[PDB]
Amino acid sequence: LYKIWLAFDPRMALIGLGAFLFALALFIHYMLLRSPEFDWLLGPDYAPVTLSAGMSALPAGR
Amino acid sequence: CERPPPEVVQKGYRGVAMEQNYNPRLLEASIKANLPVESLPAAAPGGPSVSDVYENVQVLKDLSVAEFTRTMVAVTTWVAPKEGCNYCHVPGNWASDDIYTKVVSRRMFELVRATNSNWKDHVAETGVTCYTCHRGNPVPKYVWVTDPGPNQPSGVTPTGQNYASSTVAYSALPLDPYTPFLDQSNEIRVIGQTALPAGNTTSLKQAEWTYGLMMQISDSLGVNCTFCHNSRSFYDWKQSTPQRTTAWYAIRHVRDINQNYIWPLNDALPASRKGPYGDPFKVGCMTCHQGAYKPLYGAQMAKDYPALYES
Amino acid sequence: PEYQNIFTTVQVRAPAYPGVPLPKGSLPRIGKPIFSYWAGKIGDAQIGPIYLGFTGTLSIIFGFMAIFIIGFNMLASVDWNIIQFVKHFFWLGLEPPAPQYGLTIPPLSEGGWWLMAGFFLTMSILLWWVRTYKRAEALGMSQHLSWAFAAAIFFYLSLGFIRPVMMGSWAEAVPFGIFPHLDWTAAFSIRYGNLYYNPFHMLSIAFLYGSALLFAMHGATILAVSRFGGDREIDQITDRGTAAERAAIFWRWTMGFNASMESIHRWAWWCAVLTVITAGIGILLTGTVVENWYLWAIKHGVAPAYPEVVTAVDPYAT
Amino acid sequence: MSPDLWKIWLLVDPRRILIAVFAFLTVLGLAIHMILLSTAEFNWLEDGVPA
Amino acid sequence: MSPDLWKIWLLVDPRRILIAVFAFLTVLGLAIHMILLSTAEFNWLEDGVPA
Amino acid sequence: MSAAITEYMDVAQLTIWAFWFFFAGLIIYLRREDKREGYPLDSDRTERSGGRVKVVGFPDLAEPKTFVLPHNAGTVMAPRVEAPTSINATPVAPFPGAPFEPNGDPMLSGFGPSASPDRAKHCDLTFEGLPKIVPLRVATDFSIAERDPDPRGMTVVGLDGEVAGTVSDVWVDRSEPQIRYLEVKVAAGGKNVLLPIGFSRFDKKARKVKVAAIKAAHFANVPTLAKPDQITLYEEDKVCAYYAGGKLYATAERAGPLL
Amino acid sequence: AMLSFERKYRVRGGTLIGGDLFDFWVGPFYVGFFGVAGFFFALLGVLLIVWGATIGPNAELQTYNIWQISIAPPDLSYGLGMAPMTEGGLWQIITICAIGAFVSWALREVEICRKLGIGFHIPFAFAFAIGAYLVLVVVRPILMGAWGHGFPYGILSHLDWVSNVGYQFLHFHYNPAHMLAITFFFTNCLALSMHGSLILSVTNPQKGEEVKTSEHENTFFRDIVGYSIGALAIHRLGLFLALSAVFWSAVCIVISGPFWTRGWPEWWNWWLELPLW
Amino acid sequence: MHKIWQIFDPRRTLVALFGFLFVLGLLIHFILLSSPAFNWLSG
Ligand code: BCL
Ligand code: BCL
Ligand code: BCL
Ligand SMILES: CC[C@H]1c2cc3[nH]c4c(c3C)C(=O)[C@H](C(=O)OC)c4c3nc(cc4[nH]c(cc(n2)[C@@H]1C)c(C(C)=O)c4C)[C@@H](C)[C@@H]3CCC(=O)OC/C=C(\C)CCC[C@H](C)CCC[C@H](C)CCCC(C)C
Ligand SMILES: CC[C@H]1c2cc3[nH]c4c(c3C)C(=O)[C@H](C(=O)OC)c4c3nc(cc4[nH]c(cc(n2)[C@@H]1C)c(C(C)=O)c4C)[C@@H](C)[C@@H]3CCC(=O)OC/C=C(\C)CCC[C@H](C)CCC[C@H](C)CCCC(C)C
Ligand SMILES: CC(C)=CCC/C(C)=C\CC/C(C)=C/CC/C(C)=C/CC/C(C)=C/CC/C(C)=C\CC/C(C)=C/CC/C(C)=C/CC1=C(C)C(=O)c2ccccc2C1=O
Ligand SMILES: COC(C)(C)C/C=C/C(C)=C/C=C/C(C)=C/C=C/C(C)=C/C=C\C=C(C)\C=C\C=C(C)\C=C\C=C(C)\C=C\CC(C)(C)OC
Ligand code: HEM
Ligand SMILES: CCCCCCCCCCCC[N+](C)(C)[O-]
Ligand SMILES: [Ca+2]
Ligand SMILES: [Ca+2]
Ligand SMILES: [Ca+2]
Ligand SMILES: [Ca+2]
Ligand SMILES: [Fe+3]
Ligand SMILES: [Mg+2]
């Protein structure tokens, strides 16, 4: 499908595609960091702290 | 720099932005540093009584020997685990009071017992334990003395402010709000409660002192101002949160602790327990909460030790 | 793409312009003008000469004394430690007198130095105002800048002199410090019940927001028509060209009404001036005729009411 | 300690030096007086002497 | 300490270097005195000596 | 003196109301200054009544103000009255508010983005009375900054990349030392036309001036000046407006729509 | 009506979308495709604001006092989902209408710029104001994880939101991007008064004086501060100051909560903890 | 001396000198007023 490169500048198409893919990769990595399930920066041996004796991590709200 | 999203707790009405923001990883680190100690196994009911077995028990005389022994084991873990049982006792003579730690700790028992029974407006059945402040250290980590502030030239009167201090969360606010408010009973309220002037002569400088105290309160509980206030009207109790009512009693509770328990013990304490102005290490909001909205994030340790309640 | 007229691509150098000749008996302009290349890329390359007359010289001497007193007291506050001075510099400040002194002159370290710094800074600002008045007069220009500067001075005097005198206490005035005067700003609003509900604070913000709105509109407008020589605003005012017509027509088609090349600067002048005029008035009303702005707003039906989803028991009402 | 030290006025402008020197000495003079006023042991106005 | 050390004045302007040195030495001297005044040990105005 | 004027009125309430009266008066003043140009309005309301109704809105017009131009160039009244002018276009549709289609060649129509008023037919003067916008051949003491490329000798290309000519000279503002126009020698008839700096995109690496406004063939019809070494305010508008028309008329695709 | 010099500028074309269909004028306004879309985006948003005022927070608190009218976002418990109409869903629709109206207004300015053959600085500058609004109601709420972080639509209630968000960081003045944004705002207001004064004082000179020249403008501020930026560059500077203030204001609010949760004065502990002191 | 006025402008110098003296005079009076021991406007 060479027709695409007849109508789109190869330098601008690669700059746009490269920036898009890099932005997409950064966004998806962050989306995994948002979820603690896939937050690999917590460490492979991550264990959530155990709450005992009526502990609550957060104050009560609404 | 932190990364989103924080854990947000909504306290007020929607759109009013009365919320608590917690970094989940910072919150995780704080909780791991504020874990409670597992309660000792319950003492065997019955047995000999403290009154007719021990000689110089002046506070815990209502207990049985089994519960009394359990209490001593627990306070050893809570206060002096490294120094052991001999930190508060003369070796070979338990009944001896000829050591300052024994005299202080006996008054500390009255402090805890009075707190767990008479200050439920603040500690609300969670109560306190020797561990709540000491956290396994003979000297509690977060105590305060009357701060002279930064060094000044001999002919310069200190302002007590305009100096980066962690006591006011690194603002330039008056850096020693503990002394006038958490030891003395200076008026915290500065805001006039009428639309038009009606004799409220409180200076703008006095608002900075209240602001400094509120920075220390919020830092001690790891919360922001909206945890207790609607910032559109700081004076107004009707728009505040129930935590503001608790904090009001906590201020009076801390004053009671410092004036009636810590201060009378000043003579007994060594020079290393006193500040430059000679006042002893005193109790602030940070002493128990240590950066959390509740000490040990609401862990309930006192209920397992009947020695920590008044009879 | 198209030249956006944001940076000057090619700069041209001419002999430095001495300035429009001043009338007889004026001091010669001091300084040999130089040409900064980077200043010429965004603006005019020539730096200097400056006119330093008698009034400007006196303003300098008064101004330095104020700044020196402030800095000395900042350095004294960290016990002369120059290293601690740099560390705490933003937090350092010269506090106004304590409340117990009222309007009297307290000792040096208890607000006396603040009064001297306040007075000397005020004199230099007033002297600088006279300087702006005379420079415009010497060039045959009108006194619009002096009027606008006087408006800013009025707000400055309201903050540190007029209101503290009205309140009868120097402790109400602004400390001389970076973070300390921000602490004063926050404490002022807290003390007098949420300055957001001061209607003259609301107006001041509207004009401060409007100033950024107008300069963004006007600045972008002139850059948009600069291809027609729209930056030459004097010529467009005296002899309306296509730059001024297209600029006016753009805003007429956009929002239904427009200014002229001259009157847009009257909108600009008044929006900026009203920012500090309303700022000064709102400060003078605070603490003098209104104790609590939120309660004033409640009295006048301005503060919204929210459903009571959270409330606190008042411990004083027992 | 140099017979040719007078040549410094060929390098630096004598007028700018005098302005800088006089301005610096005045500020230094004010600063030293203010340091002593900020020192209780040397504040000659608040030391109470003479009684 | 090279014999041709005098050639450095063919690279750096003597007037600018002299101004920079005099300004730096002045600010350096002020800084050291202020640091000493900040110390309890070397504040000669607040040490109570002589009594 | 108290803060309370009545049971409900207070000083702060009177002060804010006092501001609104001033602010209302101020807006009326500013709107009156706005209407010193382009008023009375041109409308079918006036056209259908035969000039009996003047459209000025509210506030009405102010009294004329005088601008005494320097070097006795005349006195210009801001709220003046201009002669009626006929546009070089026809309406696309007869309903009010409909746009107009320029007659003939749109680039040469003098309508729309290529429209321009008739400014004064005299040069803009410096403070000393010399012409302000002059070429570098007569502003001898003016020179290009050392770190910047000299525009003279650069190639001028149009919207389509076709060569239009070379920069023969640079026109500068004498009052404020900046480049205003590039004098381009058209390589079609050897006639020098001015190129405003606002329509010029310098390409320093290739020493090329890119003109996205118009094609290379359009440089032959750029309005020219009577005197080769000075330009009047009238001619400045004509030159700039011609290039501006290219932004809408140079190519068919520029009239839009995108989709 | 149209200005006495306006008729020669009313040309067909330059539309981004719609072509000849919407290319016309209504009174002074040019509508175009985005004027039609922008008007009905605005009309629906305004009508839903009035309806939100009509139902109010509840029946007892309902008010038509323009100061007290408030349309609040959802509770944070709804997250990024849609909320019921009376529980913040109205705010979500109004926000969408506002975004549609603002973008249509910006795009209508682009079409007007194309008709007049002028630069696109004005729609570009307006995009910064839109971007600041988008940060407040889209970017920051999404980063925070709930639409309830948007500010309520009310003249005074959105001030209560600003106050409480500010005190969520205990002292919002210490926000470094806030300090930078305020510096640009204050500098812009100063620069606007200076520019307005200089133009007015030159074109309206002393009594019995002729209009001054560009030399007088440059000489005037060189006599005062020793530097004159120039007649063209003051408009670059004013645009830069105004847009930088909004850019750094958008930064200051988007880092408050998403990228910083402690009190703002505590952020400066990086400087206080440098080993130099 | 006297040649000091060949390098110092008498017009600029006198204004700078008189301005400094006026500032100095104001400063000293302010310091004395601040001093309780030398404030002459008390009882
Ligand atoms: C703290 C203990 C003492 C005290 C201890 C000292 C000590 C020690 C000194 C002073 C000095 C000074 N003190 Mg004292 N001083 C005290 C309290 C005061 C009080 C007060 C209100 O109480 C005041 C107003 C002063 C004021 C003064 C100044 C007169 C003088 C600083 C001048 C200066 O800085 O010039 C700087 C500015 C200049 C412009 C310098 C240049 C001078 C002239 C104007 C330039 C031209 C010179 C001319 C050509 C010479 C011609 C000679 C040939 C004929 C050619 N002191 C207390 C009571 N004071 C200093 C002094 O004596 O300096 C002479 C000094 O060393
Ligand atoms: C302890 C506090 C004492 C006191 C002790 C002293 C002492 C000591 C001195 C003064 C001096 C002055 N005091 Mg006193 N003074 C007190 C209270 C006051 C009060 C008051 C309302 O309480 C006032 C208004 C003054 C005012 C004055 C000034 C008249 C004078 C400073 C002038 C100056 O700085 O010139 C500088 C500013 C200029 C512009 C200088 C230029 C002068 C003019 C423009 C040029 C004239 C040229 C001419 C030929 C030279 C002679 C000039 C003479 C002043 C006539 N004092 C109290 C009671 N006062 C000083 C003095 O006597 O100076 C003459 C001085 O040494
Ligand atoms: C206790 C509260 C805190 C505080 C908490 C906050 C919070 C929270 C915020 C700020 C924000 C700001 N603060 Mg702060 N701030 C405080 C104190 C100050 C002080 C001061 C003197 O003390 C100043 C000068 C400021 C200044 C600022 C600005 C930097 C900024 C607001 C401008 C802006 O965002 O533009 C942006 C402009 C817009 C968003 C306007 C959008 C325009 C839209 C596109 C068009 C609408 C069209 C309209 C509907 C048309 C109607 C039709 C009519 C007919 C005309 N703050 C105190 C310490 N501050 C805000 C910010 O930075 O946001 C980005 C913000 O959220
Ligand atoms: C319309 C309202 C806005 C506004 C307007 C405004 N400001 C103005 C003006 C106007 C119209 C002026 O004409 C005036 C000006 O000059 O502008 C360039 C000014 C001005 N606004 C300024 C600042 C300013 N404006 C601000 C705000 C605003 N100004 C408002 C937003 C702010 C804020 C927001 O805080 C500031 C900080 C100044 C730049 C200037 C007034 C300068 C002035 O009065 O200076 C007095 C003199 C001094 C302080 C000199 C001290 C510095 C010297 C370098 C000391 C050393 C000298 C020497 C070496 C000493 C030698 C030894 C001695 C012992 C002799
Ligand atoms: C970025 C630099 C500054 C700037 C620039 C700027 N603003 C601009 C422009 C530019 C360049 C325009 O060209 C454009 C314009 O046309 O100006 C006349 C505009 C404009 N800036 C405006 C306002 C404005 N700008 C502001 C700020 C700023 N604008 C910045 C400080 C503010 C502030 C700070 O509050 C306001 C209020 C308008 C006058 C206008 C854009 C008009 C517009 O978009 O019209 C469409 C919308 C309507 C006709 C009605 C609203 C429809 C909505 C659905 C209603 C709901 C709105 C909102 C969600 C709720 C209510 C808000 C509550 C807080 C009360
Ligand atoms: C009463 C009634 C009918 C109520 C019904 C209300 C209902 C139901 C709906 C209404 C809401 C709807 C649907 C709105 C649709 C869109 C409409 C009509 C929008 C109206 C336009 C509008 C928003 C106008 C607001 C303008 C305001 C308030 C401020 C703009 C900023 C301002 C202060 C501008 C004044 C200064 C001016 C004129 C600047 C422009 C200007 C600049 C900036 C130059 O640089 C320049 C240079 C050289 C020559 C001229 C100029 C020039 O004119
Ligand atoms: C080169 O400089 C050196 C190194 C020599 C000294 C350096 C000094 C430095 C680093 C100074 C730094 C200063 C800074 C950072 C200052 C910051 C100042 C700020 C932010 C100020 C902000 C607001 C202040 C205000 C608004 C003050 C207003 C005060 C007024 C209007 C006071 C008026 C007072 C009067 C008129 C006094 C009257 C006194 C009466 C009693 C008559 O006097 C007797
Ligand atoms: C019953 C439980 C407690 C016991 C046994 C106990 C024991 C002691 C002892 C032995 C000391 C002296 C230590 C020393 O000086 O080296 C002491 C001091 C102190 N305790 Fe406690 N304590 C108890 C509960 C508490 C609580 C609940 C608080 C907080 C409110 C508290 C705050 C302090 C403080 C501030 C000091 C002074 C600092 C110091 O001297 O070390 N203690 N306690
Ligand atoms: C610009 C200031 C206008 C005069 C303001 C005066 C207010 C200060 C208090 C005067 C009366 C004091 N006192 C105690 C006698 O009431
Ligand atoms: Ca903390
Ligand atoms: Ca003495
Ligand atoms: Ca010391
Ligand atoms: Ca000594
Ligand atoms: Fe302008
Ligand atoms: Mg302070």
Supply the DSSP string of C49-60, one letter for each residue: -B---HHHHHHH
DSSP B122-174: HHTTT---HHHHHTT-SS-SS-B-----S---TTS---S-SS-BGGGTTBSS-
C 73-102 residues with CB < 8 A to G: 83-84, 86-87, 90
Q: Are B132 and B295 in contact (CB under 8 A)?
A: yes
CA distance C73 to C76: 5
Q: How far is CA C62 from CA C95, C134, F20, G224, in A?
A: 20, 18, 39, 17
HEC per residue, H1-43 = CCHHHHCCCHHHHHHHHHHHHHHHHHHHHHHHHHCCCCCCCCC
DSSP letter at G33 equals H
Q: Which residue has the tokens 């004013």?
A: G238
Q: Are G74 and G92 in contact (CB under 8 A)?
A: yes
CA distance G97 to B270: 70
C110 carries a ligand binding annotation: no
Q: Are H29 and H23 in contact (CB under 8 A)?
A: no
β-bridge mates for residue C30, sequence order: C50
Sort out which chain B residues have CB atoms less than 8 A from D35's CB and list them. 153
Residues of C with a Cβ under 8 Å from any D Cβ are 68, 72, 76, 80, 107-109
Q: How many CB atoms lie within 10 A of CB G59?
A: 7
Backbone angles phi, psi at G246, to 5 degrees: -70, -40
CA distance B211 to G172: 13
Side-chain half-sphere exposure of B239, counting CA atoms within 13 A: 22
Q: Are C134 and C55 in contact (CB under 8 A)?
A: yes
DSSP letter at C286 equals B
Q: How many CB atoms lie within 10 A of CB E16?
A: 10
User: C176: part of which helix (H) or strand (E)?
Assistant: strand C176-177
In this structure, which amino acid lies at residue G7? Answer: R
CA distance F228 to F192: 9
Sort out which chain C residues have CB atoms less than 8 A from G235's CB and list them. 218-219, 222-223, 226, 231
Q: How far is Cα of residue G227 from the mean position of the Cα atoms in its chain?
A: 31
How many angstroms separate the CA of residue A12 from the nearest CA in chain B? 32
Best residue of C75, C77, C120 to probe chain D, by most D CBs closer than 10 Å = C75
Q: How far is CA C149 from CA B96, C119, C213, C278, in A?
A: 79, 18, 21, 14
From the list G40, G1, G38, the residue with the least C-alpha distance to G16 is: G38
β-bridge mates for residue C12, sequence order: F144
Nearest protein Cα to ligand 7, atom 35: C119
Residue of E nearest to C78 (CA): E38
Q: Which residue has the tokens 């597992």?
A: B38
Q: Which ligand is nearest to the CA of G106?
A: 5
Ligand 9 geometric centre to CA of C169 (Å): 10
CA distance C296 to F13: 9
Please, which chains are in contact with G (at least 3 CB pairs closer than 8 A)? B, C, F
Q: Quick one: residue B162, left, alpha or beta (phi over 0 = left, psi -120 to 50 = alpha)?
A: left
In this structure, which amino acid lies at residue B244? Answer: R
Q: Dihedral through CA G252, CA G258, CA G264, CA G268, nearest 10?
A: -90
Question: Please, where are the H alpha helices in C139-241?
Answer: 144-157, 163-167, 178-191, 199-224, 233-238
In this structure, which amino acid lies at residue B97? Answer: D
Bridge-based pairing state of the strands F208-210 and F155-157: parallel
Give burial (CB, 10 Å; 0-12/13-18/19+) of G193. Answer: buried
Q: How many CB atoms lie within 10 A of CB C35?
A: 17
Sort out which chain F residues have CB atoms less than 8 A from C289's CB and list them. 3, 10-12
D44 carries a ligand binding annotation: yes
CA distance C213 to C271: 10
Backbone angles phi, psi at F209, to 5 degrees: -105, 120
Q: Which tokens is G97 given? A: 């209408």
Q: Which tokens is B221 given? A: 């509980």
H5 carries a ligand binding annotation: no
**Cβ contacts of A60 within 8 Å, gap of 6 or more:** B9
Way the structure was solved: cryo-EM
User: C12: part of which helix (H) or strand (E)?
Assistant: strand C12-13
From the list C127, C313, C135, C279, the residue with the least C-alpha distance to C195 is: C279
Index of the ligand 9 atom closest to the CA of residue C162: 1
CA distance G6 to F248: 17
Ligand 2 geometric centre to CA of H29 (Å): 9
| Residue in B164, B198, B211 nearest the CB of C91 | B164
| Residue in D27, D30, D38 nearest the CB of C76 | D38
C185 interfaces chain G, CB cutoff of 8 Å = yes
Residue of D nearest to C77 (CA): D38
Instruction: Give exposure, D21-31, as e/b (b: 16+ Cβ within 10 Å).
Output: eeeeeeeeebb
User: F135: part of which helix (H) or strand (E)?
Assistant: strand F133-135
Q: Are B185 and C204 in contact (CB under 8 A)?
A: no
Can you point out the beta strands (E) in chain F? 66-68, 75-77, 89-91, 100-102, 133-135, 143-144, 155-157, 163-173, 178-186, 192-196, 201-203, 208-210
Q: Which residue has the tokens 């500032």?
A: H23
CA distance G106 to B60: 77
Q: What is chain H's length?
A: 43
Q: Which tokens is F166 given? A: 């070379």
In this structure, which amino acid lies at residue F250? Answer: A
From the list B243, F27, B218, F212, the residue with the least C-alpha distance to C4 is: F212
Give burial (CB, 10 Å; 0-12/13-18/19+) of C64. Answer: middle
Q: Which tokens is B283 given? A: 């109790």
Q: What is chain E's length?
A: 51
C-beta H18 within 6 A of ligand 2 = yes
DSSP letter at F211 equals -
Local structure of G70: helix, strand or coil: strand
Greatest Cα pair distance, chain E, in angstroms, is 55
Backbone angles phi, psi at C156, to 5 degrees: -60, -45
Local structure of G79: helix, strand or coil: coil
- Are residues D46 and B155, on separate chains, in Cβ contact within 8 Å? yes
CA distance G254 to G245: 14
Q: Are B21 and B42 in contact (CB under 8 A)?
A: no
B 181-220 residues with CB < 8 A to F: 195-197
In angstroms, what is the C-alpha Rg of chain G?
Answer: 24
Do chain F and chain E touch with ≥3 beta carbon pairs under 8 Å?
no
User: G249: part of which helix (H) or strand (E)?
Assistant: helix G233-255
Residue of D nearest to H37 (CA): D46
Q: Are F213 and F240 in contact (CB under 8 A)?
A: no
Q: Which tokens is F30 given? A: 């500013």
- Are residues D15 and H38, on separate chains, in Cβ contact within 8 Å? no
Q: Quick one: residue B187, left, alpha or beta (phi over 0 = left, psi -120 to 50 = alpha)?
A: beta
User: B252: part of which helix (H) or strand (E)?
Assistant: helix B242-257
Q: Which ligand is nearest to the CA of B291?
A: 10
C-beta H1 within 6 A of ligand 1 = yes
Best residue of C58, C104, C115, C128 to probe chain H, by most H CBs closer than 10 Å = C58
The long-range contacts involving G104-107, CB below 8 angstroms and separated by at least 24 positions, are G104/G34, G104/G35, G104/G37, G104/G38, G104/G41, G105/G34, G105/G38, G106/G130, G107/G16, G107/G34
**Cβ contacts of A20 within 8 Å, gap of 6 or more:** none
Q: Quick one: residue B175, left, alpha or beta (phi over 0 = left, psi -120 to 50 = alpha)?
A: alpha
Q: What is chain C's length?
A: 318
Q: What is chain A's length?
A: 62
Q: Are G200 and G220 in contact (CB under 8 A)?
A: no
Q: Which tokens is C215 given? A: 């300069």
DSSP letter at F40 equals S
Declared resolution, Å: 2.2
Local structure of F170: helix, strand or coil: strand
Side-chain half-sphere exposure of G69, counting CA atoms within 13 A: 15
Q: Are F144 and F137 in contact (CB under 8 A)?
A: no
Local structure of C121: helix, strand or coil: helix
DSSP G131-161: HHHHIIIIIHHHHHT-GGGSPPEETTHHHHH
From the list F66, F195, F225, F118, the residue with the least C-alpha distance to C245 is: F118
List all residues whose CB is within 6 A of at least one atom of ligand 3: C 185-186; G 102, 129-130, 132-133, 135-136, 162-163, 165-167, 172-173, 178, 181-182, 185, 246, 249-250, 252-253
C-beta C168 within 6 A of ligand 9 = yes
Q: How many CB atoms lie within 10 A of CB C47?
A: 18
C-beta B139 within 6 A of ligand 8 = yes
Sort out which chain F residues have CB atoms less than 8 A from B196's CB and list them. 3-4, 10
CA distance G252 to G174: 11
B225 carries a ligand binding annotation: yes
Local structure of G85: helix, strand or coil: helix
Backbone angles phi, psi at F186, to 5 degrees: -70, 125
In this structure, which amino acid lies at residue G77? Answer: S
Q: How far is CA C133 from CA C23, C30, C56, C138, in A?
A: 15, 19, 11, 9
Q: Are F82 and F65 in contact (CB under 8 A)?
A: no
C 297-316 residues with CB < 8 A to F: 299-300
Q: What is chain B's length?
A: 311
Q: Which tokens is C169 given? A: 């206490």
CA distance C181 to F174: 46
Q: How far is CA A56 from CA A59, B293, C149, E18, G255, in A?
A: 7, 10, 57, 68, 27
In angstroms, what is the C-alpha Rg of chain F?
Answer: 25
C-beta B143 within 6 A of ligand 8 = yes
DSSP B32-84: HTTPPPPPPPPPPSSS-BSTTT-SS-SSSTTSBHHHHHHHHHHHHHHT-TTTG
Nearest protein Cα to ligand 9, atom 3: C166
Q: Are C269 and C150 in contact (CB under 8 A)?
A: no
CA distance F225 to F202: 24
Q: Are A47 and B32 in contact (CB under 8 A)?
A: no
Bridge-based pairing state of the strands G29-30 and F208-210: unpaired
CA distance H30 to H21: 14
How many angstroms separate the CA of residue A11 from the nearest CA in chain B? 34
β-bridge mates for residue C176, sequence order: C94
- Are residues H16 and C116, on separate chains, in Cβ contact within 8 Å? no
F 200-229 residues with CB < 8 A to C: 200-202, 204, 212-213
User: F195: part of which helix (H) or strand (E)?
Assistant: strand F192-196
Sort out which chain B residues have CB atoms less than 8 A from A26's CB and list them. none
Q: How far apart are the first and last CA of chain H?
A: 49
CA distance G52 to G161: 18
Local structure of B7: helix, strand or coil: strand
CA distance C195 to C189: 5
Backbone angles phi, psi at G27, to 5 degrees: 60, -125
CA distance G117 to G123: 14
Q: How far is CA B217 from CA B163, B177, C243, G102, in A?
A: 19, 10, 60, 43
CA distance G115 to F254: 10
CA dihedral for A32, A35, A41, A46, sign (positive or negative): negative
